[PDB]
Design a protein around this ligand. Structure first.
Ligand SMILES: Nc1nc2c(ncn2[C@@H]2O[C@H](COP(=O)(O)OP(=O)(O)OP(=O)(O)O)[C@@H](O)[C@H]2O)c(=O)[nH]1
Ligand SMILES: Nc1nc2c(ncn2[C@@H]2O[C@H](COP(=O)(O)OP(=O)(O)OP(=O)(O)O)[C@@H](O)[C@H]2O)c(=O)[nH]1
Ligand SMILES: Nc1nc2c(ncn2[C@@H]2O[C@H](COP(=O)(O)OP(=O)(O)OP(=O)(O)O)[C@@H](O)[C@H]2O)c(=O)[nH]1
Ligand SMILES: Nc1nc2c(ncn2[C@@H]2O[C@H](COP(=O)(O)OP(=O)(O)OP(=O)(O)O)[C@@H](O)[C@H]2O)c(=O)[nH]1
Ligand SMILES: [Mg+2]
Ligand SMILES: [Mg+2]
Ligand SMILES: [Mg+2]
Ligand SMILES: [Mg+2]
Ligand SMILES: [Mg+2]
Ligand SMILES: [Mg+2]
Ligand SMILES: [Mg+2]
Ligand SMILES: [Mg+2]
Lengths: 229, 229, 229, 229
């Protein structure tokens, strides 16, 4: 009857024998972490909750997910190249993982933050993406890339917010001080002038949250994913 | 450094000057509605909640949404043929609307169901799609199609469940009984044997839930949407 | 047995109810035309060959083509927004039109250039493209855009080559010479110094080449394609 | 000015680090070879024409092709997993090989068939396609799939037409006579009843036509393509 409109849709699928990354990146989590007054560069609970949602998800698809890695508002799920999940539908993959994740976020909020509840006008909601990785080397480098990303970001943010806190700086000059440095330089700027050793930093913050199937862990890259299969 | 993995993504975008439909349809909502013991054929609270999320979602993007229409676990949001929202990106449209709606559902569950709190192991989560409609007639027809679908379904399901309830039938001979029947025939099964008149069914069940901008109403297809532009 | 590799293909199609443009443009036609000594930026024979090919093509699909417009090495074919040809498929439409065209080119060459035969090492070969246009305006404007292009460029290159030919200019100072000018300014540069009038330039050069179904004509935009339906 | 129409085009490309195949299959080659009265089901000259074309094609892009394999009206060209050609664009790869090839066919037709020239109303034109293969296994299997199809088809069609030709059979009873047979059974039907030995059938008909870079060979699968890289 009016059914012909269904003609217009698109059911496109990810290429066979490719890994699938589904990545989830929270929308405006700058302002979102501002409103609920998160813990500044790093909120132990906010990050842990992310981990919770991620764990529940890889638990949910325990067969198709090799592992996951979370950063800020972001979390990444690796789908084995052989997966038939959702008949390899991009939309279904992305949207469904995202909704499920979002749903676990909202659900589990009460546990991690009895402090400040959700109000309404300001809510979490997340982006989701399907990315095709044809061979193992690429997935490995993808995962690495995220890991880099977290490393750099925590470094910069940490030595930035210490300067404001400890040395009383404004956002402008704390930036100029940090401009053009190295990884090591900032760690010195942390160690002497901010007076804090960066290795003494908690390990979930530096090296990011990596969920294998079930129980989850935090360390660098040694690719023993090579072994897990 | 590793950044070339971003080389693998796809930013594909809805063709310019096309109306957009972002459709949301809950996953495994049969099991969902069974576990929380929804009101079978129709749960007033459930549908209303759905409506709440919708109202908040067209509120959120006021500029780009013409209107929305909800059915069961489904909602359809129309975007204006000229919209730049999220730069016309399929992924972002779909996934973001999905997260948001979902987020809204889990938030407002506390409100609509003090009866049964959420547990965990059963959580609401929804699928999302983008569709591209090159002209007004098709988008119109689309909406029509949805409405038709809700009218037909509601009639079948209603005479089905009143057969089971009132006359104590098993699903099978209720199916074969209902098999190959017609409109007036179902409604006849309804009033005589099931002792209930169909026109007195709440309007929101029969004709579905239509969200215009801000507040929302429930009737058929008469295109007064044609006038609002 | 090995047949699974077939499952790797992609069957993607043009969104329904969109006019379709198929554009053909010959690769390296600068070097090509330079090799075969085409006449300056205007060769009656080459353009007539192109037109003949296109005439053959709209002859071939008389059912799906509204009309077609040639400029240089370019030819654009407008398929009706309703067409089901090749089931609306990109690969088939681009490559098949391209092939067909290329084949007619190479066929009818001996006709249009009995002067010089084809050699081998340099052969005509053409890029083809599929574009979707969701309504009338867009299509009209596309066509416009093309006609525009042919008109403008006919003027610029004409006066350029007269500056080189008649006035003995080198390209560089002919370019700085023509730089910044206007339409009638250029026509004057043509009329006084180079001794030719641009209104008597052949209407096929100026207003571009246009083929409706069957017989073909050259003028501007008066969109009388409006009526044909 | 009208330029916005260009914003409707589509740049979609092949996923990085995938072998590409460009396959070429002439539309309606049944009627073409019927019209030009080709040789039963194997025309030596037709095949070598096809071959010279593909050689010129691999010749043209010597950098990005591992090799090419032709069968009937078909030819397949394997592009290396790392290729940047046409910036990996679907449209350009398909249409360009399509057109070059078509051009080469029509050109070198003179050489291969001095017997009957091309006419007009019946002209060769070819469908072209792109396929992405994420790994060597699959590209190998692709090729295998092809060689398989040609071997199988050559036997079936050969004893088919020998049954028609020599024993005076009509297509129906040849079709049944051949129905459900095995390889060796068919070669029998060939040796006892049609009087011909399928071992002495020309290796270019049986084992297909394989172009490595430059000069080209006909044998089976022994993948020394593994070493050439
Ligand atoms: N305060 C605070 N913010 C966090 C924390 N974890 C993540 N975030 C926020 O999330 C951001 C991560 O980068 P983005 O995802 O690009 O920020 P975004 O603006 O929310 O996301 P987009 O709109 O997609 O660009 C940071 O700027 C933080 O503000 C945290 O533990 N504490
Ligand atoms: N009992 C009850 N069920 C509802 C209500 N609203 C929606 N539903 C359920 O939602 C379903 C709608 O159909 P689908 O969305 O295709 O069901 P689904 O199995 O969850 O979805 P998929 O797994 O993606 O195919 C119905 O079968 C209903 O059971 C309600 O108000 N009451
Ligand atoms: N000499 C001559 N050249 C022509 C004529 N018509 C078209 N051309 C050539 O066609 C070109 C038109 O632009 P393009 O199609 O972009 O040329 P191209 O660089 O060979 O094509 P691409 O590689 O696809 O960009 C001019 O540079 C001319 O060299 C003609 O009548 N005479
Ligand atoms: N007689 C003859 N036919 C050949 C030869 N080589 C290829 N063919 C034709 O090639 C065809 C291969 O299949 P297709 O190309 O799919 O046939 P088609 O109907 O012409 O093409 P499509 O419309 O694309 O399906 C066979 O039907 C043959 O008729 C040959 O050497 N001799
Ligand atoms: Mg973000
Ligand atoms: Mg981020
Ligand atoms: Mg559903
Ligand atoms: Mg449904
Ligand atoms: Mg060109
Ligand atoms: Mg041009
Ligand atoms: Mg064919
Ligand atoms: Mg074939």
């Amino acid at each position: 009857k009016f059914g012909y409109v269904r003609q217009f849709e698109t059911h496109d699928v990810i290429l066979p024998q490719c890994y699938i990354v589904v990545r989830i990146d929270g929308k405006k989590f700058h302002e979102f972490s501002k409103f609920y007054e998160f813990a500044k560069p790093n909120d132990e609970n906010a990050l842990k909750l992310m981990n919770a949602c991620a764990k529940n998800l890889v638990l949910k698809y325990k067969n198709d997910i090799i592992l996951a890695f979370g950063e800020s508002d972001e979390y990444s799920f690796i789908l084995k190249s052989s997966t038939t999940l959702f008949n390899r539908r991009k939309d279904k993959l992305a949207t469904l993982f995202g909704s499920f994740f979002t749903s676990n976020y909202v659900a589990l909020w009460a546990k991690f933050f009895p402090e400040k509840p959700l109000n309404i006008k300001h809510l979490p909601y997340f982006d989701s993406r399907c990315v095709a990785y044809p061979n193992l080397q690429t997935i490995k480098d993808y995962l690495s890339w995220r890991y880099v990303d977290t490393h750099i970001n925590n470094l910069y943010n940490t030595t930035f917010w210490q300067l404001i806190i400890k040395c009383g700086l404004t956002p402008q000059e704390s930036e100029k001080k940090l401009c053009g440095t190295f990884s090591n330089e900032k760690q010195e700027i942390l160690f002497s002038e901010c007076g804090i050793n960066y290795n003494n930093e908690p390990e979930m913050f530096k090296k990011g949250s990596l969920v294998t199937r079930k129980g989850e862990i935090l360390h660098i890259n040694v690719i023993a994913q090579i072994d897990e299969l």
